[model samples]
Target: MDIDNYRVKPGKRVKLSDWATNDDAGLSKEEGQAQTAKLAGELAEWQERLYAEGKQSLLLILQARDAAGKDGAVKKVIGAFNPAGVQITSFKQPSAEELSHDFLWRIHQKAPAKGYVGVFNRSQYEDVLVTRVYDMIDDKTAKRRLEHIRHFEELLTDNATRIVKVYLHISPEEQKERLQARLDNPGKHWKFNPGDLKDRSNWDKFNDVYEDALTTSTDDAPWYVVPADRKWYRDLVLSHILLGALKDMNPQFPAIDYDPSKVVIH
Candidate 1:
């Protein structure tokens, strides 16, 4: 599949409706899962190279609506990598201290260190998404925050960090089913939040703000809208996206000065 089909072109207007939420990219479920497994192995190898190189970093920012499978994507896709070189941060309601600082303050602190891979389950984009949807931030402020996000990502890119932003696109119908499954399963009761319904109520509003936020996509940090209605397909597509990023980085093992044959073991 041409992954570029899912990418949000820089400066292009985004109407989430224009993107398919249930596309399978012509791959059967079994085929997709098999490819995903193969990609996972390759991803692990690349992670080792990235960690050994110790010169650059990779950042993956995930944004989605309620029950859109962000957590599942992380578990199935990114979970393939060794944890030593990976960092996962899930952003929730900001704490008092976090709220006191500028919007990007807490986010900047979570950026991956050199040679590491950082995953933000939810991220700085929330400043523009949730706040704007709830009217906590007016349109003028939201517009300014979007500009800041572009600049912040550019700064990270200039410092040798590769940023891959993904928006998990799921239909409201699919989300309802997932949410209901949570309620039906006693073991998953804890995962179900009544507040999620409140967010669902503002689905259209959220879509509008998301479109605005996604338009900020730049060459340095482009956003990919993945069809997330099919769990297997979603995981498969993400594996491709990430592996492509690592391939472009082409990290390598550092050369050692000492010859292995001449070195003696104690």
Candidate 2:
């Protein structure tokens, strides 16, 4: 499949209203799951090479509304790689300590080292998304923050980090269903947040701000709006994009200095 079909055009504002929520990537659950597994195996090969080379990194930024499958994507797709080769950070609401510093400070400290794949669940874009949605920041301030974000991503790429931002798009109906599931399952109750319902009521407002952030911040790092209503398809598509990126980077294992023919086995 052509993954670029989902990539956001640089500098072009994307209205989520124009995007699909019920869309599937023309695959059944069985097909998508099988494909995802296959793609993940391929990805692991490159991931091991990346670690052995220790010269490049992959940063995957995941942004989504409540119950849009960000956590699931991390576990299902990215989780397939060697644990030692991956690092994941889930950004929550800013703590008092976090709020006192620049928004990028916490994020920068977590940047994946060369040879690792880092995943960000909800990310620096939150400063532009949630902060703007609740009127904590005006449009002018949000735009300024987005400019900073653009530059920060540029710095990451300049240092050999390949950045991929994914916006998991789920309909409000799907979100409600997922939230209700959280409420019904005793094990999942901890995931349920009453505040999520309040945010759901302001869904369009979030989408409006999201469009601005995606348009403004994506340049060196492109944002892919993956249809996420179906968990299987979501995982499969993400694996494809990630594998393609690693292929583009073409990370290779470092050459051994000593000749194997002269080596002795202990």
Candidate 3:
């Protein structure tokens, strides 16, 4: 797949409506899953090299509406990496201490250190997204925060942290069905949240703010808007995106000081 098709070019206006929420990228489910599995194997090997190299890091930020499969994606793809080298943070509402600091304070603390892969289920974008949707921050404030986000990402990139941001684009109809499935199944009850409905009620506003967040995407920390109505396709696309990032980094095992060929076995 041409991953660039999903990338939001810098300085371009984004209208989520123009993007398909259920696009299969011309691949059948079985083919997509097989490709994703192949990518996962490569990703696993690269992750070990990244950890051993101890010189660079990867930060993957995931932003999505309710039931867009952020957790599912993490569980299927990012979870394939060695846990010791991966840090997954799921950002929820701020606590008292978190509220006292700047919006990015908590987020920055969770950034992947060198030799690690960091995953953010919902990230700093929430400062501009949910806040704007609820009128907690006005347009002027939101714009400033967006600028802050750009600078923050640039800072991370400059520090050897490869940032890969993804926005899971799922249709409202799909989300509705997913939510209903949660209610219908006893096992999924815990996933259902009443607040999710509140967000769904203002879907258009959320989409608007999402577009705003995506537009701020820069070359260093680009955003990929992935179609997510099909769970298999979503995982497949994410695997490719992540594998692509690691391949670009091309981390390698550190050079050793001693000659192993001259050493005797214990």
Candidate 4:
């Protein structure tokens, strides 16, 4: 497989798209399906053993533009994992209950318990990136927020949860086309959004926000920049990285103390 080239070992990360493809990582539909199938198989195998081991939990963070394919990416990349062992959480606007307390309250509540993998469509980092960029947090508060995020991850790391933060790097032009396609296609109309364009106007601003996140979060949880253009290469690269991470954790099914051979068949 062309996956090894993108593998990220301990204390490492990569720009998935830039390296996986030519100057442009864009893919034809034919390529996307093939890669997604390969990725789904790899993730399924890893997830089974990891869950059986019951030693550590894996946390995946997905951050991207309005139509950067986060949904499709998750559906294609890790779709076959044991559902009981995997949980996905999508963070939308703050709810009344959520805003009532700390910013991390909603997120912390859904964090993966031991023996599982949790996927976050957008995560606690949103406090530093989106919140900070849009003035939802003041400069003073934003800086403190970074420390809060780091501290949270530190706790998770110390407690057996390993986080892999993935950033989908996409251009404004790409987002424009994606948004239009979602609107033009009835199947994807559910994803239509006019306000997303308003946000697209601040593409550079969001980049600045993520740059801060990429650097600041580097200490406890490093960020991997994944390309969303070519879905195949993107899936392939992520599976490669994810497989390495799980392997490094040395996950395996736990052995039973009792002798099955001595037990009589029912």
Q: Give TM per candidate.
A: 0.97, 0.96, 0.97, 0.85
lDDT of 2: 0.89
Q: Per-residue CA lDDT of candidate 3, range 37-118, in tens?
A: 8888899999999999999999999999888999999999997898999999999999999999999999999999999999
lDDT: which candidate is best?
1
Question: Each candidate: how many clashes?
Answer: 0, 0, 0, 0
- Which 10 residues in a row give candidate 1 its minimum summed lDDT? 212-221
lDDT of 1 by residue, 129-206 (tens): 989988999999999999899999999999899999999999999999999999999999999887799999999999
lDDT tens digits, residue span 152-248, model 2: 9999999999999999999888888999999999999998877888898888898888888788435568999999989888898899989999999
* Backbone clash pairs in model 4 (N, Cα, C under 3 Å; residues 3+ apart or in different chains), count: 0
- Candidate 2 TM-score to native: 0.96
TM-score order of candidates, top first: 1, 3, 2, 4
User: What C-alpha lDDT, on a 0 to 100 scale, does residue 229 get in candidate 3?
Assistant: 99
| Model 3 steric clash pairs | none
- When 2 and 4 are scored with TM-score, the better candidate is 2
Deviation (Å) of 200 in candidate 1: 1.5
Overlapping backbone residue pairs in candidate 2 total 0
